Structure formats: structure tokens, C-alpha cells
Amino acid sequence: TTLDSKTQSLLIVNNATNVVIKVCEFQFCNDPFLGVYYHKNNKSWMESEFRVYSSANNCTFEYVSQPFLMDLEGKQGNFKNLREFVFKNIDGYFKIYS
Amino acid sequence: NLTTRTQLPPAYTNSFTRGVYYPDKVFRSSVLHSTQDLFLPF
Amino acid sequence: YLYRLFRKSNLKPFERDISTEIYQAGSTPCNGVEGFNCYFPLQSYGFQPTNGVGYQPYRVVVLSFELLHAPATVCGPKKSTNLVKNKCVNFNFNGLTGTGVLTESNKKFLPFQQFGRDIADTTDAVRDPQTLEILDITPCSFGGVSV
Ligand SMILES: C=CC1=C(C)/C(=C/c2[nH]c(/C=C3N=C(/C=C4\NC(=O)C(C)=C4C=C)C(C)=C\3CCC(=O)O)c(CCC(=O)O)c2C)NC1=O
Ligand SMILES: *[C@@H]1O[C@H](CO)[C@@H](O[C@@H]2O[C@H](CO)[C@@H](O)[C@H](O)[C@H]2NC(C)=O)[C@H](O)[C@H]1NC(C)=O
Ligand SMILES: *[C@@H]1O[C@H](CO)[C@@H](O)[C@H](O)[C@H]1NC(C)=O
Ligand SMILES: *[C@@H]1O[C@H](CO)[C@@H](O)[C@H](O)[C@H]1NC(C)=O
Ligand SMILES: *[C@@H]1O[C@H](CO)[C@@H](O)[C@H](O)[C@H]1NC(C)=O
Incomplete structure (x- = not known):
């Protein structure tokens, strides 16, 4: 609603290993992101920075699925895939269709 | 920042022709079902 | 044990609200602190052990569910039996109670689907709980009879 830790807030994030869903009183920064960082010793791109929220407290629901490895490297060319989702919020249920 | x-x-x-989910x-099968819900207009 | 004394609007069903912003009873905002005409939205109950029946703490639980439309995971206390096939019984597939002969089928059920309904909206395809397989149902009082 306000996204300033005065009210609850849902947060869905794949951090390249798992998907985490947190409903927790985040105090967000103005420009959240994920920092992928590139290594020169090997041609491997990896996530390094997680600066979405400045805090997390007073919170009830939290889910983390199984781990998975995904190719977050820089792929050059056309978009080789499409992903569509629909989010609804009906009577206390947040429905995600994929 | x-x-x-x-x-x-x-x-x-x-x-166009997007935003349809299984209700x-x-x-x-083999049914022309009709629904009313929150759908993305064509 | 606390309850939300003030909110600027009522809730929707099954919605939680753990906010603590000061509720501006008056028209003048008081910048989120306590004062006059703007009050703390939560109030604590007083549950003395020797206070009236209407003030005694009551424990409430609400079991909310939806019946016979999705793959069941919770089951009742009833012990299963062995189905009698090609003959009509008082079957019970994850709760439904009907009557009719059963038969095998080869329909391609999606994983999140567990029932299958025909044009008449009655059950024409079912998945057996213990054995993962797709079946279909027909009645047994069928066929016209002329005399
Ligand atoms: C962030 C939340 C998130 C959700 C809700 C999610 C759902 C999700 N993604 C899947 C596949 C997959 N999803 C992706 C990629 C993605 N799909 C996405 O929603 C996102 C954000 C990415 C990456 C940026 C890939 C690569 C696969 C499997 C291989 C493929 O489909 O190409 C599957 C099918 C799993 C299976 O049946 O084996 C689910 C349920 N994945 C997630 O990371
Ligand atoms: C959900 O959040 C929004 C805003 O965060 C609420 O909408 C506001 O409600 C207050 C009074 O309750 C009004 O003064 C504002 O004008 C409203 N703003 C908007 C954009 O609607 C909304 O009430 C909340 N939903 C519920 C059920 O309480
Ligand atoms: C990032 O993924 C790792 C490995 O699955 C997981 O342990 C961690 O919880 C995730 N990050 C956060 C903030 O949860
Ligand atoms: C909310 O967080 C603050 C600080 O952690 C704490 O004082 C307060 O008790 C918390 N309220 C709830 C309902 O958790
Ligand atoms: C800069 O960062 C601080 C705290 O991270 C934040 O309060 C401020 O809004 C940001 N300003 C801009 C222009 O991003």
C-alpha cells in the first residue's frame, strides 16, 4: 500500500538459487535492485548484492522452495522465451497464474 | 541510489488475445464454457 | 491481547491489518504521534479472572476449506475398502456420495486437476486417490423398459 514499513508488503524474489516469498514490513530503498557481478578469472556471472529492503520485521508468512541453478549470464540476441503472469487479490488470497 | x-x-x-487463465x-473438454471474472480485455 | 480500535474503513474478508499509524479522529493531522482527536489504533483487552461472562476471553478457531473441486490432501477418519468394479455401489471418491458403475478411462488430466465434469455438470471423470489413474463413471439404473 505505502511500501515504507508502516504496513505489510509482499515481496517475491528469485535470487538465482531459490524463490523467496516474504510478507514482511520492509523499509524499501528508493531504487531497489539485484546486483549481478561479473568475474574476470572465469566467464561466470553471479549474484552478489541484495539491497531491496533496509529492514524486515513483524512478519508472519514466508516461503522458500527447492534450490535451483539458472543461467543468469549475459545472452546476446533475440528474446528466446516469454513469461506471462497474472496477479489477483481476492478475499485474503493472492492468486498468481503463470 | x-x-x-x-x-x-x-x-x-x-x-490482444492475452490474459486468459483457467478459471x-x-x-x-469439448465445452464452450462462459465465465464472468476479472479478465484482461481484448 | 489487543484489538484494532480504529480504522478508516472496514476490512475485506480474510484480510489482516497489523499497522500502527495513528488514526486521525479529527480533521487536523497530528503527524503520527499521540494527542487530541488522534488516537492509537490498537486497544488492549482487560481480561480479569473475576469479570463478567461477556468479558471473559474466548478462544476461537475457524477451519476454512472448499469441498470436492481440487486434489484433496486432508482425509477423514474412514478406513478405505476395495472397489467393486463393473457393478454399481455406493462409492465414495474423496467425499462425494453417489451410485453408479465405474470404468477405466484414458483422459489426460492436468496435475492440478482431480475431477472432470461433463456438459450436465455431473462427474464423468475421476482420479482414484490411492492408485494414480483416470477413470470414468456411468449409472446403473439406465435404459428404458417397455412392457
Ligand atoms: C520469481 C519467482 C518465480 C516463480 C513464481 C517461478 C515459478 C516457476 N518457474 C518455473 C520454470 C522455470 N522458470 C524460469 C525462469 C523464470 N520464471 C520466473 O517467473 C522468473 C522471474 C524467472 C527468471 C528470471 C526457467 C528458466 C524455468 C525452467 C526452464 C525453462 O522454462 O526455460 C516453474 C515450473 C517448475 C517445474 O514444473 O519444474 C515454476 C512453477 N520461478 C521463479 O523464479
Ligand atoms: C488499502 O490501502 C489504500 C491506501 O493505502 C486505502 O485507500 C485509502 O483509504 C483511506 C481511508 O481508509 C482514504 O482516505 C484514501 O483516500 C484511500 N486512498 C485510495 C487510493 O483509495 C484502502 O482503504 C485500503 N483498503 C481497505 C479495505 O482498507
Ligand atoms: C538466496 O538463495 C539462497 C540459496 O538458496 C538462500 O539460502 C537465501 O535464503 C536466499 N536469499 C534470502 C535473502 O533469502
Ligand atoms: C513491530 O516491531 C517493533 C520493533 O521491532 C516492535 O516494537 C513491535 O512490538 C512490533 N509489533 C508486532 C505486532 O510485531
Ligand atoms: C538516496 O538514498 C537514500 C537512502 O538510501 C534515500 O533516502 C534517498 O531517497 C535516495 N535519493 C535518490 C534521488 O535516489
Whole structure:
């Protein structure tokens, strides 16, 4: 609603290993992101920075699925895939269709 | 904070025949079912 | 044990609200602190052990569910039996109670689907709980009879 830790807030994030869903009183920064960082010793791109929220407290629901490895490297060319989702919020249920 | 920005007017696109989801969890075949719900207009 | 004394609007069903912003009873905002005409939205109950019946703490639980439309995971206390096939019984597939002969089928059920309904909206395809397989149902009082 306000996204300033005065009210609850849902947060869905794949951090390249798992998907985490947190409903927790985040105090967000103005420009959240994920920092992928590139290594020169090997041609491997990896996530390094997680600066979405400045805090997390007073919170009830939290889910983390199984781990998975995904190719977050820089792929050059056309978009080789499409992903569509629909989010609804009906009577206390947040429905995600994929 | 990130400041290397270049704002542009909001770009628009025509979305057509998109935003249809299975409205329930029941198997149903060879049926012209009709529903009323929150759907993305064509 | 606390309850939300003030909110600027009522809730929707099954919605939680753990906010603590000061509720501006008056028209003048008081910048989120306590004062006059703007009150703390939560109030604590007083549950003395020797206070009236209407003030005694009551424990409430609400079991909310939806019946016979999705793959069941919770089951009742009833012990299963062995189905009698090609003959009509008082079957019970994850709760439904009907009557009719059963038969095998080869329909391609999606994983999140567990029932299958025909044009008449009655059950024409079912998945057996213990054995993962797709079946179909027909009645047994069928066929016209002329005399
Ligand atoms: C962030 C939340 C998130 C959700 C809700 C999610 C759902 C999700 N993604 C899947 C596949 C997959 N999803 C992706 C990629 C993605 N799909 C996404 O929603 C996102 C954000 C990415 C990555 C940026 C890939 C690569 C696969 C499997 C291989 C493929 O489909 O190409 C599957 C099918 C799993 C299976 O049946 O084996 C689910 C349920 N994945 C997630 O990371
Ligand atoms: C959900 O959040 C929004 C805003 O965070 C609420 O909408 C506001 O409600 C207050 C009074 O309750 C009004 O003064 C504002 O004008 C409303 N703003 C908007 C954009 O609607 C909304 O009430 C909340 N939903 C519920 C059920 O309480
Ligand atoms: C990032 O993924 C790792 C490995 O699955 C997981 O342990 C961690 O919880 C995730 N990050 C956060 C903030 O949860
Ligand atoms: C909310 O967080 C603050 C600080 O952690 C704490 O004082 C307060 O008790 C918390 N309220 C709830 C309902 O958790
Ligand atoms: C800069 O960062 C601080 C805290 O991270 C934040 O309060 C402020 O809004 C940010 N300003 C801009 C222009 O991003």
C-alpha cells in the first residue's frame, strides 16, 4: 500500500538459487535492485548484492522452495522465451497464474 | 541510489488475445464454457 | 491481547491489518504521534479472572476449506475398502456420495486437476486417490423398459 514499513508488503524474489516469498514490513530503498557481478578469472556471472529492503520485521508468512541453478549470464540476441503472469487479490488470497 | 537515468514518455503497446487463465481446477473438454471474472480485455 | 480500535474503513474478508499509524479522529493531522482527536489504533483487552461472562476471553478457531473441486490432501477418519468394479455401489471418491458403475478411462488430466465434469455438470471423470489413474463413471439404473 505505502511500501515504507508502516504496513505489510509482499515481496517475491528469485535470487538465482531459490524463490523467496516474504510478507514482511520492509523499509524499501528508493531504487531497489539485484546486483549481478561479473568475474574476470572465469566467464561466470553471479549474484552478489541484495539491497531491496533496509529492514524486515513483524512478519508472519514466508516461503522458500527447492534450490535451483539458472543461467543468469549475459545472452546476446533475440528474446528466446516469454513469461506471462497474472496477479489477483481476492478475499485474503493472492492468486498468481503463470 | 541510481542516477544515470534518461526518462522517456510512457510507451504504449496493443495487447490482444492475452490474459486468459483457467478459471477453476476442474477437467472440462469439448465445452464452450462462459465465465464472468476479472479478465484482461481484448 | 489487543484489538484494532480504529480504522478508516472496514476490512475485506480474510484480510489482516497489523499497522500502527495513528488514526486521525479529527480533521487536523497530528503527524503520527499521540494527542487530541488522534488516537492509537490498537486497544488492549482487560481480561480479569473475576469479570463478567461477556468479558471473559474466548478462544476461537475457524477451519476454512472448499469441498470436492481440487486434489484433496486432508482425509477423514474412514478406513478405505476395495472397489467393486463393473457393478454399481455406493462409492465414495474423496467425499462425494453417489451410485453408479465405474470404468477405466484414458483422459489426460492436468496435475492440478482431480475431477472432470461433463456438459450436465455431473462427474464423468475421476482420479482414484490411492492408485494414480483416470477413470470414468456411468449409472446403473439406465435404459428404458417397455412392457
Ligand atoms: C520469481 C519467482 C518465480 C516463480 C513464481 C517461478 C515459478 C516457476 N518457474 C518455473 C520454470 C522455470 N522458470 C524460469 C525462469 C523464470 N520464471 C520466473 O517467473 C522468473 C522471474 C524467472 C527468471 C528470471 C526457467 C528458466 C524455468 C525452467 C526452464 C525453462 O522454462 O526455460 C516453474 C515450473 C517448475 C517445474 O514444473 O519444474 C515454476 C512453477 N520461478 C521463479 O523464479
Ligand atoms: C488499502 O490501502 C489504500 C491506501 O493505502 C486505502 O485507500 C485509502 O483509504 C483511506 C481511508 O481508509 C482514504 O482516505 C484514501 O483516500 C484511500 N486512498 C485510495 C487510493 O483509495 C484502502 O482503504 C485500503 N483498503 C481497505 C479495505 O482498507
Ligand atoms: C538466496 O538463495 C539462497 C540459496 O538458496 C538462500 O539460502 C537465501 O535464503 C536466499 N536469499 C534470502 C535473502 O533469502
Ligand atoms: C513491530 O516491531 C517493533 C520493533 O521491532 C516492535 O516494537 C513491535 O512490538 C512490533 N509489533 C508486532 C505486532 O510485531
Ligand atoms: C538516496 O538514498 C537514500 C537512502 O538510501 C534515500 O533516502 C534517498 O531517497 C535516495 N535519493 C535518490 C534521488 O535516489
